Amino acid sequence: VNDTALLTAFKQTSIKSDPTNFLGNWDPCTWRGVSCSSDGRVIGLDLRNGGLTGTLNLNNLTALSNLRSLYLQGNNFSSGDSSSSSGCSLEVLDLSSNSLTDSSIVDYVFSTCLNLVSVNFSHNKLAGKLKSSPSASNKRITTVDLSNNRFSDEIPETFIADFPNSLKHLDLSGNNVTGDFSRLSFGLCENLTVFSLSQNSISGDRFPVSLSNCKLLETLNLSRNSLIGKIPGDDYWGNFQNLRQLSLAHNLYSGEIPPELSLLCRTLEVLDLSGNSLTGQLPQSFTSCGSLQSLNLGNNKLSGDFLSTVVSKLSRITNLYLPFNNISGSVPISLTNCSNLRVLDLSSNEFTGEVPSGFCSLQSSSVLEKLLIANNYLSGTVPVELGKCKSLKTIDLSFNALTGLIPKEIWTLPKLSDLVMWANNLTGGIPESICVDGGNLETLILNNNLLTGSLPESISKCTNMLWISLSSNLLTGEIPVGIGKLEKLAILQLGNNSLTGNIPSELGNCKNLIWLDLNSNNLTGNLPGELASQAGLVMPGSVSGKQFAFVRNEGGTDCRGAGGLVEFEGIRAERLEHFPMVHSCPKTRIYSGMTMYMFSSNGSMIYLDLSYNAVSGSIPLGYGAMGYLQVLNLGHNLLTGTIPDSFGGLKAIGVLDLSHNDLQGFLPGSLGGLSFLSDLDVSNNNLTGPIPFGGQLTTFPLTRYANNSGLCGVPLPPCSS
Ligand SMILES: *[C@@H]1O[C@H](CO)[C@@H](O[C@@H]2O[C@H](CO)[C@@H](O[C@@H]3O[C@H](CO[C@H]4O[C@H](CO[C@H]5O[C@H](CO)[C@@H](O)[C@H](O)[C@@H]5O[C@H]5O[C@H](CO)[C@@H](O)[C@H](O)[C@@H]5O)[C@@H](O)[C@H](O[C@H]5O[C@H](CO)[C@@H](O)[C@H](O)[C@@H]5O[C@H]5O[C@H](CO)[C@@H](O)[C@H](O)[C@@H]5O)[C@@H]4O)[C@@H](O)[C@H](O[C@H]4O[C@H](CO)[C@@H](O)[C@H](O)[C@@H]4O[C@H]4O[C@H](CO)[C@@H](O)[C@H](O)[C@@H]4O)[C@@H]3O)[C@H](O)[C@H]2NC(C)=O)[C@H](O)[C@H]1NC(C)=O
Ligand SMILES: CC(C)[C@H](C)[C@@H](O)[C@H](O)[C@@H](C)[C@H]1CC[C@H]2[C@@H]3CC[C@@H]4C[C@H](O)[C@H](O)C[C@]4(C)[C@H]3CC[C@]12C
Ligand SMILES: *[C@@H]1O[C@H](CO)[C@@H](O[C@@H]2O[C@H](CO)[C@@H](O)[C@H](O)[C@H]2NC(C)=O)[C@H](O)[C@H]1NC(C)=O
Ligand SMILES: *[C@@H]1O[C@H](CO)[C@@H](O[C@@H]2O[C@H](CO)[C@@H](O)[C@H](O)[C@H]2NC(C)=O)[C@H](O)[C@H]1NC(C)=O
Ligand SMILES: *[C@@H]1O[C@H](CO)[C@@H](O[C@@H]2O[C@H](CO)[C@@H](O)[C@H](O)[C@H]2NC(C)=O)[C@H](O)[C@H]1NC(C)=O
Ligand SMILES: *[C@@H]1O[C@H](CO)[C@@H](O[C@@H]2O[C@H](CO)[C@@H](O)[C@H](O)[C@H]2NC(C)=O)[C@H](O)[C@H]1NC(C)=O
Ligand SMILES: *[C@@H]1O[C@H](CO)[C@@H](O[C@@H]2O[C@H](CO)[C@@H](O)[C@H](O)[C@H]2NC(C)=O)[C@H](O)[C@H]1NC(C)=O
Ligand SMILES: *[C@@H]1O[C@H](CO)[C@@H](O[C@@H]2O[C@H](CO)[C@@H](O)[C@H](O)[C@H]2NC(C)=O)[C@H](O)[C@H]1NC(C)=O
Ligand SMILES: *[C@@H]1O[C@H](CO)[C@@H](O)[C@H](O)[C@H]1NC(C)=O
Ligand SMILES: *[C@@H]1O[C@H](CO)[C@@H](O)[C@H](O)[C@H]1NC(C)=O
Ligand SMILES: *[C@@H]1O[C@H](CO)[C@@H](O)[C@H](O)[C@H]1NC(C)=O
Ligand SMILES: *[C@@H]1O[C@H](CO)[C@@H](O)[C@H](O)[C@H]1NC(C)=O
C-alpha cells in the first residue's frame, strides 16, 4: 500500500466533485495540498476551502504511515463507511466546515491517534450523545473543539474529567446537550485555560465543586443556557486568579451583581452578564478592574448612577453595553473619563436630558466609533459637539424627543456610516454635500420626522448605501434620478410624503434593490418596466443581519400601505406597540427579527408598495417575473389595461393589491397557481368574467371583488346563471 496509491484511492473513492480543479495534477510530493517530507513520505494534506464534495472515511487516509496533519476544513465532506482498520499518527486534525454526521469518527480519533495535539470537529452535523473521552494513553492532546454540532441529551458525569491532564482548550458550544450542571465533574482540571458550554440547555442552581480546581482558567463561557439562581459570590471567584473572560449571559440569573465577583479584577478583561434578570447596580468593588475592556450588562433590570460612581473609574473601558435596563436620569458626564471608549450602548433606558457629547472634547482625539441611545427620553437638539468625534461610524438617536435641525457637522463626519435618528421631531433638510465631504453612508434612516425639502441628487455619491428610510416626513419635490448609481442599495422607503414627478427609470440599475416603498405620495407618470429588469440577478448584500420590525396593517386596502418596516436596533417592542403610527390601522401585528435573505443568488425584488399615488398607464408585463416578490401593492392609482397573465409567476407572493384603478378584462387563471396568496384585493375596477377557481381565490371575502364590471363565480353568484 504505497502512499501515492492511497491518496489516489482517496480522490476517487471519497471525492465526488472538484469544481475548483484544485485537486488536479494528482510523485506524491508534487500533488496540490500534500506537504511531503525529505525521505519521500507524506506527512500532511492541506485541502482547506477547496469546495470539495464527497464521503469521508478517515481510515482510508490514516493508512498513510507518516501522516500527521490533515486539513479538510471548508469543504462539503459527508460521513463515510467504516471501511478498514488502520493505525493513526495524526497530530493535528481539522474538519471544521463539512457535513459530517457520524460521530464514530470522534471515537476513532479519541481511541487511536495517541499523538493527537489538536482536533477541530466544529461546524458539522455530528449527532448523538457524548460518550467517550480521549484515550488515557494519549499524553499530548491539548485543544479539542466539538462546537457547533447537534450533540444531544445528558453529558456524562466524568466526560470532562476523563480527558488527559494536558487539556488546555475545550469548546462544547453550539449543541443541545442537557443536564444539571452541578453533577458534572471536571476532575483535577489541571492546565485547563479555555472552557465553553455556551448555547446549550444546561440547568442547575449550583456550579460543580470540581470547577474550582481549574486554577488556570482564562476563559469561562456559559452563555445561552438555563442556569438559575443567584450568581456565586463569597470566596468562589478567588479560585480563578487567571480568569480574563467570563460569560454568564442569557441564563436565568436573578438578584444583584455580587460584589465578590470583583475578585477577578486583577485579570478580568471581558465580562458579559447580559440577558438575565439582574437588579440593583454594578457594585462599587469593581473600581479595581483596571484591566476590564468589554463590559456588557444589557437586557437586565439594573438602575442607579453606577455609570458615574463606578464605570467612569474604569480607565481601560473600550466597549460598554448597557441597553435595555432601567437607568434613569441624565447620562453622566463623568463617563468621558473613559479615555479609550470606542462603543457606548445605552439604548432602551429611562435616560433624560440632552445628548451626551463630552467624549469628543477630550484633551486627546476621541476614539468613539459607535454611540447608541435609542428608545430614551432625550430632548433638545443634536449637539454640534459630536462633529469633533472624527472616528464616529454609527449614530443611533432614534425614538427620543429630539427636535430642531440636524447640524451640518453631522453630515461632514469623515467616517460616519450609519445615521439612524428616526422617530423624532427633527426638522430641516438634507444637505447637497452628503457623502462627498462627509462619510459614504451605509444607512440613512430618518423616517417619522418633520424633515422638509427634496432629496438631493448628491445622494448619488453614497455608493455604499444599503438602506434609506425617509417615510412619513414632509418631503417634497421629485425622486432624484441619481439613485440609480446606488448598486448596493437594498431598501428604499419614501412613503407618506408629498413626492411629485415620475418614478425614475434609473431605479432599474439598483442591482441589489429588494424593498421599494413609495406609498401615499403624489407621483404620476407610467409604471417603469425597468423595476423588474434585475429579476433573477439580485445578489444579497451587507444589509443582511440587521434588526428590523414589521408592523402589518391588517385592515385591508382602507389602511394606507401594506405595512411598516422599521430599523429596530435598541428599541423595545412595547415602545412600538404604543407608537400612534401603529394605531393608524385598527388591526395590527408586530413581526420582528433580523434581516435575512431567502436566496443566495439570482434573486428578485421582495417588497413593492406603490399604492396611493396617481400613476397611469398599463402594468408592465415584466413585473410578473419576480419570483421572490412577496408583496405587490399597486392599489389606489389610475392604472389601466389588464392584469398580465405573467402574474402567475409571482410564486412567493402573499399579498396582491390592485384595487381602486381602471384595470379592465379578466382575472388571470394562473392566480390560482399561487400557493401562498393569502391577501388579494381587486375591488373597485372595471374587471369582468369568472373568478379563477384554483388556489385560494374562491375563499376571499366578498369585499375583495366588489364594485367591478361583471365579475361572476364563487364567492360571487355563479357565472352560468
Ligand atoms: C461565548 O460564546 C458565545 C457563543 O456561544 C459567543 O457569542 C458569539 O459572539 C460573537 C462575537 O463576534 C457573535 O458574532 C457576532 O454577532 C453579531 C450579531 O450579534 C447579535 O446577534 C447574534 C445572533 O442572535 C440570534 O441568535 C441568537 C442565538 O443564536 C438568538 O438568541 C437571537 O434571538 C438571534 O436570533 C434571531 O436571529 C436568528 C438569525 O436570523 C434567527 O434564527 C432567530 O430566529 C432570530 O430571528 C447574537 O449572538 C449576539 O449576541 C451577542 O451580543 C449581545 C449584545 O451585545 C449579547 O447579549 C450576547 O451575549 C452576545 O455577546 C457577544 O457580542 C457582544 C457584542 O455584540 C460582546 O459584548 C460579548 O462579549 C459577546 O461576544 C447579538 O444579539 C454580528 O454583528 C457579527 O457579525 C460580524 O462578524 C462576522 C464574522 O464573525 C461577519 O461575517 C459579519 O459580517 C459581521 O462583521 C462586521 O464586523 C466585523 C468586525 O467585527 C467587520 O470585519 C465586518 O466588516 C462587519 O462590520 C458576529 O457574527 C455571535 O453572534 C455570538 N453568538 C451567540 C450565540 O451569542 C461569545 O462571544 C462568547 N463570549 C466570550 C466572552 O468569549
Ligand atoms: C428587507 C428584508 C431582507 C426583510 C428584513 C426580510 O428578511 C423579512 O423576512 C420579510 C420579507 C418578512 C418579515 C415579515 C413578513 C410579513 C408578515 C406579515 C404578512 C403576512 C402575510 O401572510 C403575507 O406573508 C404578507 C406579510 C406582509 C409578510 C411579508 C414578508 C415579511 C415582510
Ligand atoms: C454537498 O454535498 C451534498 C451531498 O452530500 C449535496 O446535497 C445534495 O445536492 C443535490 C444537488 O446537487 C440535491 O439534489 C440533493 O438532494 C442533496 N442531498 C442532500 C442529502 O442534501 C449538496 O448540494 C452539496 N453542497 C454543495 C456542493 O454546496
Ligand atoms: C424597567 O423598565 C421596564 C421596561 O420599560 C418596565 O417594564 C414594563 O413595565 C410596564 C408597566 O406598566 C409594562 O406595561 C410593560 O409591559 C413592561 N415591559 C416589559 C418589557 O416588561 C419595568 O416596569 C421597569 N421597572 C421599574 C422598577 O420601573
Ligand atoms: C403620515 O405621517 C403623518 C405625520 O404627521 C401622520 O399624521 C398624523 O396623523 C395622526 C392620525 O391619528 C394624528 O394623530 C397625528 O397628530 C398626525 N401627526 C401630525 C404631526 O400631523 C399621518 O397619519 C401619516 N399617514 C400615514 C398614512 O401613515
Ligand atoms: C397630494 O395628494 C394628497 C392626497 O390626495 C392631496 O391632499 C388631498 O387633496 C384633496 C383634494 O380634494 C383633499 O380633499 C384632501 O383632504 C387632501 N388630503 C388628503 C389626506 O387626501 C394633496 O393636495 C396633494 N399634493 C400635491 C402637492 O399635489
Ligand atoms: C444568475 O446570475 C448569473 C450571474 O449574473 C447569470 O450568469 C452570468 O451572468 C453574467 C452577467 O451577470 C454573464 O456575463 C454570464 O455570461 C452569465 N453566465 C451564464 C448565463 O452562464 C445567470 O444567467 C443567472 N441565472 C438565471 C437568471 O437563471
Ligand atoms: C363600492 O362603492 C360604493 C360606492 O362608492 C362604496 O360605498 C361608499 O362607501 C363610502 C365609505 O364608506 C361612503 O362614504 C359612501 O357614501 C358610500 N357610497 C354609497 C353610494 O353608499 C363601497 O364601500 C364600495 N365597496 C368596496 C368594497 O370598496
Ligand atoms: C476505503 O477503502 C475501502 C477498501 O477498498 C473501500 O471499501 C471504501 O469504500 C473506502 N472508503 C472511502 C470513503 O472511500
Ligand atoms: C499539566 O499539568 C501538570 C500538573 O501541573 C503538569 O505536570 C504537566 O506538565 C501539564 N501539562 C502541560 C502540557 O502543560
Ligand atoms: C433541546 O433540548 C431541550 C431540553 O431537552 C428540548 O426541550 C428542546 O426541544 C431541544 N431542542 C431541539 C431542537 O431538539
Ligand atoms: C413630537 O412631539 C410630540 C409633542 O407632543 C410628541 O408627542 C411626539 O411623540 C414627538 N414625535 C416623535 C416621533 O417622537
Side-chain angles (χ1 to χ4, degrees):
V1 173
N2 178 236
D3 291 7
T4 57
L6 277 168
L7 303 179
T8 47
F10 178 48
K11 180 176 172 184
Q12 295 175 337
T13 62
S14 301
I15 297 187
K16 316 285 179 193
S17 171
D18 178 15
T20 54
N21 301 312
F22 162 49
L23 297 168
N25 62 274
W26 279 31
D27 293 353
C29 311
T30 63
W31 294 0
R32 278 211 211 82
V34 171
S35 289
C36 242
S37 59
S38 48
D39 47 352
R41 276 289 188 86
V42 171
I43 58 172
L45 177 61
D46 191 339
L47 306 178
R48 65 189 68 192
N49 312 333
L52 305 179
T53 306
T55 64
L56 169 62
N57 177 242
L58 217 64
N59 284 279
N60 301 62
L61 277 177
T62 57
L64 293 168
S65 178
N66 288 10
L67 182 57
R68 304 208 314 261
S69 308
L70 177 52
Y71 299 99
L72 299 185
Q73 69 270 26
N75 303 277
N76 190 31
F77 281 109
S78 303
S79 280
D81 210 5
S82 297
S83 171
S84 297
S85 166
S86 46
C88 171
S89 300
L90 286 173
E91 296 186 359
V92 187
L93 180 64
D94 199 349
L95 311 175
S96 316
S97 291
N98 295 296
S99 308
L100 301 183
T101 69
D102 187 357
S103 84
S104 80
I105 190 173
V106 180
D107 277 5
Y108 173 69
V109 175
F110 279 11
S111 69
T112 61
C113 305
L114 305 174
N115 290 344
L116 205 78
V117 178
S118 62
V119 61
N120 192 339
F121 290 108
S122 69
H123 288 95
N124 266 283
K125 291 176 175 180
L126 300 171
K129 303 181 178 181
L130 295 171
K131 312 160 287 196
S132 73
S133 311
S135 177
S137 60
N138 181 315
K139 314 299 180 186
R140 326 198 148 180
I141 199 162
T142 52
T143 69
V144 174
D145 192 339
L146 297 163
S147 67
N148 289 273
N149 276 289
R150 296 177 178 175
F151 293 109
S152 313
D153 304 313
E154 271 225 311
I155 309 178
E157 173 170 1
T158 64
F159 174 75
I160 299 171
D162 291 351
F163 273 70
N165 221 34
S166 60
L167 183 73
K168 276 201 164 66
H169 190 306
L170 175 56
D171 191 352
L172 307 171
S173 313
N175 299 277
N176 203 33
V177 296
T178 60
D180 187 350
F181 191 47
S182 62
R183 304 298 277 103
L184 223 68
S185 180
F186 288 74
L188 307 183
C189 188
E190 290 169 343
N191 302 318
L192 184 62
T193 68
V194 172
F195 175 70
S196 179
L197 252 173
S198 179
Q199 202 172 29
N200 286 291
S201 295
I202 296 308
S203 44
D205 62 342
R206 290 155 224 158
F207 283 7
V209 195
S210 58
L211 176 61
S212 65
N213 296 334
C214 318
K215 307 298 181 178
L216 302 187
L217 205 57
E218 287 178 17
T219 62
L220 174 59
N221 192 339
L222 304 176
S223 73
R224 297 194 188 280
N225 282 284
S226 303
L227 299 173
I228 198 160
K230 265 68 185 181
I231 296 178
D234 292 330
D235 295 320
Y236 189 78
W237 298 105
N239 289 284
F240 318 96
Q241 352 189 13
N242 302 50
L243 197 60
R244 302 177 190 165
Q245 307 182 20
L246 172 68
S247 185
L248 303 180
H250 292 278
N251 286 278
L252 315 175
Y253 281 119
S254 56
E256 296 176 323
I257 299 178
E260 297 79 5
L261 190 60
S262 76
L263 284 167
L264 311 167
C265 276
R266 266 175 42 265
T267 63
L268 186 61
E269 303 174 341
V270 177
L271 186 66
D272 187 6
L273 304 176
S274 57
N276 286 278
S277 295
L278 297 172
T279 56
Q281 45 177 76
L282 193 67
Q284 289 297 137
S285 57
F286 273 74
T287 53
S288 164
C289 254
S291 311
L292 191 67
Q293 288 164 50
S294 182
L295 175 58
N296 195 326
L297 305 170
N299 266 96
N300 279 289
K301 310 185 191 196
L302 304 175
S303 59
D305 186 60
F306 68 94
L307 283 177
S308 185
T309 72
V310 178
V311 172
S312 73
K313 306 193 196 174
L314 303 167
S315 58
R316 283 181 66 75
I317 268 282
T318 63
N319 294 74
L320 180 66
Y321 315 96
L322 298 138
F324 298 97
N325 279 287
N326 293 86
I327 303 173
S328 53
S330 298
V331 180
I333 196 172
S334 63
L335 208 58
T336 66
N337 283 339
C338 302
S339 59
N340 292 321
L341 190 66
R342 278 189 208 279
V343 173
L344 171 64
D345 190 348
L346 304 167
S347 306
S348 292
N349 278 282
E350 310 178 23
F351 281 110
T352 53
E354 223 152 32
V355 174
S357 55
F359 312 105
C360 319
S361 301
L362 291 180
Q363 290 202 30
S364 280
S365 303
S366 188
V367 301
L368 184 63
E369 298 183 7
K370 295 196 178 192
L371 180 65
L372 310 157
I373 325 182
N375 189 23
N376 282 280
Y377 309 113
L378 302 182
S379 54
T381 66
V382 171
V384 172
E385 177 178 27
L386 292 173
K388 300 173 61 168
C389 274
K390 291 295 182 198
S391 300
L392 271 173
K393 307 190 187 210
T394 296
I395 295 161
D396 198 341
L397 303 174
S398 56
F399 249 117
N400 281 290
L402 303 182
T403 63
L405 180 125
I406 298 171
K408 300 159 145 218
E409 289 76 3
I410 306 293
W411 307 96
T412 50
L413 287 174
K415 294 218 177 200
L416 188 63
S417 171
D418 305 291
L419 181 62
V420 180
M421 304 182 297
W422 71 284
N424 285 301
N425 278 314
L426 304 169
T427 56
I430 303 308
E432 179 65 18
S433 63
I434 55 186
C435 301
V436 76
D437 285 342
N440 192 337
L441 299 171
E442 279 187 351
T443 56
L444 178 62
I445 298 164
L446 300 164
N447 54 277
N448 294 94
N449 273 306
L450 304 170
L451 302 177
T452 67
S454 66
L455 182 65
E457 294 278 353
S458 180
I459 194 71
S460 70
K461 259 62 203 193
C462 313
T463 48
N464 300 340
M465 187 68 65
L466 307 170
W467 188 349
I468 291 170
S469 189
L470 303 171
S471 48
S472 288
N473 276 286
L474 299 164
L475 301 178
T476 62
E478 289 185 326
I479 297 165
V481 300
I483 202 76
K485 302 300 204 190
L486 312 187
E487 299 186 348
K488 285 192 161 187
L489 181 64
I491 304 168
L492 180 59
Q493 301 170 278
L494 300 172
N496 191 21
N497 286 274
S498 302
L499 297 175
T500 59
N502 305 319
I503 301 168
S505 159
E506 291 75 0
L507 281 167
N509 294 91
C510 303
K511 302 303 193 284
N512 296 12
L513 180 61
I514 55 165
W515 191 295
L516 179 59
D517 185 356
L518 303 179
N519 76 88
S520 299
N521 280 278
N522 300 75
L523 296 167
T524 57
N526 306 312
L527 288 173
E530 289 84 353
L531 282 182
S533 51
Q534 293 297 336
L537 307 167
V538 168
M539 299 296 299
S542 298
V543 62
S544 71
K546 302 195 178 278
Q547 291 287 8
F548 83 95
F550 185 85
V551 185
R552 180 59 216 288
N553 282 330
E554 313 190 72
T557 63
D558 168 29
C559 290
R560 313 267 299 202
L565 172 66
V566 296
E567 191 274 349
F568 215 61
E569 183 61 26
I571 305 170
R572 290 190 174 104
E574 70 197 19
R575 189 79 186 260
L576 193 59
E577 299 176 17
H578 301 316
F579 196 42
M581 161 288 296
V582 163
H583 301 304
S584 176
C585 195
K587 309 199 240 289
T588 62
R589 175 180 179 182
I590 300 297
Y591 299 90
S592 180
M594 300 187 62
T595 59
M596 196 183 67
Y597 276 94
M598 67 293 293
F599 53 79
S600 121
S601 67
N602 290 107
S604 83
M605 202 181 295
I606 295 165
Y607 188 100
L608 181 58
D609 188 351
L610 307 170
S611 61
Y612 288 94
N613 284 277
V615 186
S616 46
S618 299
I619 298 171
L621 287 53
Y623 283 19
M626 299 192 269
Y628 292 95
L629 186 64
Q630 231 155 323
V631 173
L632 171 56
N633 187 358
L634 308 180
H636 300 259
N637 278 269
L638 308 170
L639 299 173
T640 57
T642 302
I643 301 172
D645 283 305
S646 64
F647 275 41
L650 302 172
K651 296 175 178 182
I653 202 166
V655 179
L656 180 59
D657 185 359
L658 307 170
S659 67
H660 295 83
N661 280 283
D662 293 323
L663 292 171
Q664 289 199 132
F666 300 111
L667 293 169
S670 62
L671 300 179
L674 301 177
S675 56
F676 301 109
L677 177 62
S678 65
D679 189 356
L680 177 75
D681 200 329
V682 292
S683 65
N684 290 268
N685 282 275
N686 194 329
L687 297 174
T688 190
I691 299 186
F693 191 79
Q696 318 72 24
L697 279 80
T698 55
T699 58
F700 294 132
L702 277 171
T703 69
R704 308 297 230 270
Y705 307 106
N707 284 341
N708 274 295
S709 167
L711 283 180
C712 60
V714 190
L716 287 186
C719 296
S720 58
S721 278

PDB file of all heavy atoms in Angstrom, residues 619-631:
ATOM      1  N   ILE A 619     -49.824  48.134 -16.540  1.00  0.00           N
ATOM      2  CA  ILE A 619     -48.873  47.381 -15.725  1.00  0.00           C
ATOM      3  C   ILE A 619     -47.856  46.704 -16.638  1.00  0.00           C
ATOM      4  O   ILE A 619     -48.241  45.911 -17.509  1.00  0.00           O
ATOM      5  CB  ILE A 619     -49.594  46.337 -14.855  1.00  0.00           C
ATOM      6  CG1 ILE A 619     -50.556  47.024 -13.883  1.00  0.00           C
ATOM      7  CG2 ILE A 619     -48.580  45.469 -14.113  1.00  0.00           C
ATOM      8  CD1 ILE A 619     -51.473  46.067 -13.141  1.00  0.00           C
ATOM      9  N   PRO A 620     -46.559  46.972 -16.481  1.00  0.00           N
ATOM     10  CA  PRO A 620     -45.566  46.285 -17.314  1.00  0.00           C
ATOM     11  C   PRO A 620     -45.648  44.773 -17.151  1.00  0.00           C
ATOM     12  O   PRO A 620     -45.807  44.256 -16.043  1.00  0.00           O
ATOM     13  CB  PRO A 620     -44.230  46.839 -16.806  1.00  0.00           C
ATOM     14  CG  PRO A 620     -44.568  48.161 -16.222  1.00  0.00           C
ATOM     15  CD  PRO A 620     -45.940  48.005 -15.630  1.00  0.00           C
ATOM     16  N   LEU A 621     -45.548  44.061 -18.279  1.00  0.00           N
ATOM     17  CA  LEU A 621     -45.617  42.603 -18.239  1.00  0.00           C
ATOM     18  C   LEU A 621     -44.463  41.996 -17.451  1.00  0.00           C
ATOM     19  O   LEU A 621     -44.635  40.952 -16.810  1.00  0.00           O
ATOM     20  CB  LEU A 621     -45.633  42.025 -19.657  1.00  0.00           C
ATOM     21  CG  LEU A 621     -46.908  42.160 -20.497  1.00  0.00           C
ATOM     22  CD1 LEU A 621     -47.421  43.588 -20.582  1.00  0.00           C
ATOM     23  CD2 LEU A 621     -46.657  41.596 -21.893  1.00  0.00           C
ATOM     24  N   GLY A 622     -43.287  42.625 -17.481  1.00  0.00           N
ATOM     25  CA  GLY A 622     -42.133  42.063 -16.800  1.00  0.00           C
ATOM     26  C   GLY A 622     -42.305  41.920 -15.302  1.00  0.00           C
ATOM     27  O   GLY A 622     -41.585  41.134 -14.677  1.00  0.00           O
ATOM     28  N   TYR A 623     -43.247  42.660 -14.710  1.00  0.00           N
ATOM     29  CA  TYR A 623     -43.424  42.620 -13.261  1.00  0.00           C
ATOM     30  C   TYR A 623     -43.764  41.220 -12.762  1.00  0.00           C
ATOM     31  O   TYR A 623     -43.472  40.887 -11.607  1.00  0.00           O
ATOM     32  CB  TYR A 623     -44.516  43.605 -12.839  1.00  0.00           C
ATOM     33  CG  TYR A 623     -44.076  45.057 -12.818  1.00  0.00           C
ATOM     34  CD1 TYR A 623     -42.942  45.476 -13.507  1.00  0.00           C
ATOM     35  CD2 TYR A 623     -44.795  46.008 -12.106  1.00  0.00           C
ATOM     36  CE1 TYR A 623     -42.541  46.798 -13.488  1.00  0.00           C
ATOM     37  CE2 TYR A 623     -44.401  47.331 -12.082  1.00  0.00           C
ATOM     38  CZ  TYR A 623     -43.274  47.720 -12.775  1.00  0.00           C
ATOM     39  OH  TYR A 623     -42.875  49.037 -12.756  1.00  0.00           O
ATOM     40  N   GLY A 624     -44.384  40.392 -13.603  1.00  0.00           N
ATOM     41  CA  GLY A 624     -44.786  39.058 -13.191  1.00  0.00           C
ATOM     42  C   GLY A 624     -43.666  38.045 -13.084  1.00  0.00           C
ATOM     43  O   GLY A 624     -43.906  36.922 -12.628  1.00  0.00           O
ATOM     44  N   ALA A 625     -42.451  38.412 -13.486  1.00  0.00           N
ATOM     45  CA  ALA A 625     -41.308  37.512 -13.457  1.00  0.00           C
ATOM     46  C   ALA A 625     -40.472  37.649 -12.189  1.00  0.00           C
ATOM     47  O   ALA A 625     -39.341  37.152 -12.152  1.00  0.00           O
ATOM     48  CB  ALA A 625     -40.430  37.752 -14.686  1.00  0.00           C
ATOM     49  N   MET A 626     -40.993  38.308 -11.156  1.00  0.00           N
ATOM     50  CA  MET A 626     -40.282  38.469  -9.888  1.00  0.00           C
ATOM     51  C   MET A 626     -40.689  37.326  -8.965  1.00  0.00           C
ATOM     52  O   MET A 626     -41.732  37.379  -8.309  1.00  0.00           O
ATOM     53  CB  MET A 626     -40.584  39.834  -9.282  1.00  0.00           C
ATOM     54  CG  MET A 626     -40.143  40.992 -10.174  1.00  0.00           C
ATOM     55  SD  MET A 626     -40.164  42.596  -9.353  1.00  0.00           S
ATOM     56  CE  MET A 626     -41.828  43.150  -9.721  1.00  0.00           C
ATOM     57  N   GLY A 627     -39.856  36.281  -8.916  1.00  0.00           N
ATOM     58  CA  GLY A 627     -40.235  35.049  -8.245  1.00  0.00           C
ATOM     59  C   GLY A 627     -40.187  35.097  -6.736  1.00  0.00           C
ATOM     60  O   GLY A 627     -40.886  34.315  -6.083  1.00  0.00           O
ATOM     61  N   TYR A 628     -39.390  35.992  -6.163  1.00  0.00           N
ATOM     62  CA  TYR A 628     -39.313  36.142  -4.717  1.00  0.00           C
ATOM     63  C   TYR A 628     -40.185  37.279  -4.203  1.00  0.00           C
ATOM     64  O   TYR A 628     -40.259  37.485  -2.987  1.00  0.00           O
ATOM     65  CB  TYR A 628     -37.861  36.361  -4.283  1.00  0.00           C
ATOM     66  CG  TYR A 628     -36.978  35.148  -4.476  1.00  0.00           C
ATOM     67  CD1 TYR A 628     -36.208  35.002  -5.620  1.00  0.00           C
ATOM     68  CD2 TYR A 628     -36.918  34.149  -3.513  1.00  0.00           C
ATOM     69  CE1 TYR A 628     -35.400  33.897  -5.801  1.00  0.00           C
ATOM     70  CE2 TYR A 628     -36.113  33.041  -3.683  1.00  0.00           C
ATOM     71  CZ  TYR A 628     -35.356  32.918  -4.831  1.00  0.00           C
ATOM     72  OH  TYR A 628     -34.551  31.814  -5.006  1.00  0.00           O
ATOM     73  N   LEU A 629     -40.843  38.014  -5.097  1.00  0.00           N
ATOM     74  CA  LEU A 629     -41.740  39.086  -4.689  1.00  0.00           C
ATOM     75  C   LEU A 629     -42.825  38.538  -3.771  1.00  0.00           C
ATOM     76  O   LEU A 629     -43.587  37.646  -4.157  1.00  0.00           O
ATOM     77  CB  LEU A 629     -42.360  39.736  -5.923  1.00  0.00           C
ATOM     78  CG  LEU A 629     -43.221  40.975  -5.683  1.00  0.00           C
ATOM     79  CD1 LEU A 629     -42.387  42.111  -5.103  1.00  0.00           C
ATOM     80  CD2 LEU A 629     -43.902  41.401  -6.976  1.00  0.00           C
ATOM     81  N   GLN A 630     -42.893  39.077  -2.556  1.00  0.00           N
ATOM     82  CA  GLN A 630     -43.845  38.622  -1.552  1.00  0.00           C
ATOM     83  C   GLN A 630     -45.013  39.577  -1.360  1.00  0.00           C
ATOM     84  O   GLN A 630     -46.102  39.136  -0.977  1.00  0.00           O
ATOM     85  CB  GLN A 630     -43.126  38.423  -0.213  1.00  0.00           C
ATOM     86  CG  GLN A 630     -43.365  37.075   0.430  1.00  0.00           C
ATOM     87  CD  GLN A 630     -42.243  36.687   1.367  1.00  0.00           C
ATOM     88  OE1 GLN A 630     -41.075  36.972   1.096  1.00  0.00           O
ATOM     89  NE2 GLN A 630     -42.586  36.033   2.474  1.00  0.00           N
ATOM     90  N   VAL A 631     -44.814  40.868  -1.615  1.00  0.00           N
ATOM     91  CA  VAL A 631     -45.867  41.871  -1.515  1.00  0.00           C
ATOM     92  C   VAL A 631     -45.834  42.736  -2.768  1.00  0.00           C
ATOM     93  O   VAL A 631     -44.770  43.225  -3.162  1.00  0.00           O
ATOM     94  CB  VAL A 631     -45.710  42.740  -0.253  1.00  0.00           C
ATOM     95  CG1 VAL A 631     -46.707  43.886  -0.270  1.00  0.00           C
ATOM     96  CG2 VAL A 631     -45.888  41.889   0.997  1.00  0.00           C
TER      97      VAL A 631
END
